[PDB]
């Protein structure tokens, strides 16, 4: 995250760091106990494999997330119509092992409904462990950011990403720049407020540079996949 | 797809809307009938999609509990979750509803429910299926 | 981490090469080491990969059969033998680690390799 501030414990207690091998790879974010929403181009092959993926909620630091701390994930599941080459459909699901225990620092994100009604330029929130400057390292703290929604019409437009977005994408942050996601936040929480409710309305997918004007970030369109996330829930249950 | 026609997902299988969540599956995966329940809006409004006027309609609260909301609940994948329900007044511009027969037998949930003109509670079901969306 | 792939050069086709991948940093952050490829004008394509105890490899379908990942855990050297090499081989190639090939930013650029040419 590039111009945001610290988070306090509890302040994104849906955030997830998702390891491979016991270093920090994609964020993620809890919808249930055992399911987490992240992006798919974290976990092309060989990463589609459960074994190496561990989730740690409810820490803020990377350092405190020990090998033996964190849930082995279950099953990782991209959307069956993701495109790498165009980034289009870009989420996915993993299932932990066991269920997470909610408390004040670990609680789920709601999924959105039909009918939300959003602002054109309603207010968001961003989080994750990724950068915090173009070319940085991986942030040891989990960081958190305003964000405002660009219009897909205005981020379609010839000098931001010409015609890139698709309905399955959908466009945050500032045409000025200086606020953005970036490299290490794949995968984790675009949300929004509204009747005193925190919604995931999207998933960190991608961007060209970080924090740059009329280059913002795009993340993956969640209200257009809650069909495909409950028929993978269904299907899981029985 | 033509007609008003429901694409099975993005299969290319378009089904007539009178057999959408009728009770038989009639797409390649199953779609017509595994997405038959929703929540509506910020406030929750059960939903279920009505085979006979194929369209979307909230649930009346008549001889509603929260036996059903579960089972609504875990119709949408949320197994043994519930959270929180209300009977709420409507306010989706819905015309008619959905209503629950108590007598309906062992069935999928959205088949437990006929289409009605009228709710006698004068309320429709806002169903929440896991606490979340809270934070500091 | 910080990683130097090396061993490339210009080979005909049939012919083998050995490119290895020195890493400097925590042995705890090289749980899994990729090599990934780039010709140009293509979109880079993941080659394979290897587990730190070597428990566990991966090669992508358009070289399994033909190379081989291996590691030196002595000297923390991840190794790719590549034989039969085809003109369609031809690229630079990379090696990366997850939080480095896992990219918000498919078109970045801050991951140096080694130059592979197969060419009569
Ligand atoms: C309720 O279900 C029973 C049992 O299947 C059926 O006989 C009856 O007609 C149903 N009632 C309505 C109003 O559809
Ligand atoms: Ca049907």
Redesign the interface.
Known sequence: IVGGESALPGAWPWQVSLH???????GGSIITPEWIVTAA??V????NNP??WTAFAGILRQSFMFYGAGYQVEKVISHPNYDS?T?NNDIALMKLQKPLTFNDLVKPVCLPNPGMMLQPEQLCWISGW?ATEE?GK?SEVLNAAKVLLIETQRCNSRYVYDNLITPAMICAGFLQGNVD??????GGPLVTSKNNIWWLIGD???????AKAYRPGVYGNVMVFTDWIYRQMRADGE | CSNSGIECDSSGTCINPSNWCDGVSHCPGGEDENRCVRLYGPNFILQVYSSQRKSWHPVCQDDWNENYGRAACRDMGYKNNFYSSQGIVDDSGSTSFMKLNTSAGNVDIYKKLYHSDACSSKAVVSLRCIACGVNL | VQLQASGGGFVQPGGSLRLSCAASGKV??Q??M?WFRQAPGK?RE?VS?I??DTK?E?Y?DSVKGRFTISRDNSKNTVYLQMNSLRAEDTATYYCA???MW???????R?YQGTQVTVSS
């Open positions: 491979v091998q016991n270093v920090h790879v994609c181009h974290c092309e092959k060989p990463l074994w190496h080459k980034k990724g070319k991986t996601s970036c490299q290490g936040d794949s960190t997918s991608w961007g060209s540079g970080c | 705890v952050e749980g899994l990729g979109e993941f990969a587990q730190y566990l991966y992508a680690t997850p939080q896992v990219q918000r930013d498919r078109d970045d801050w």
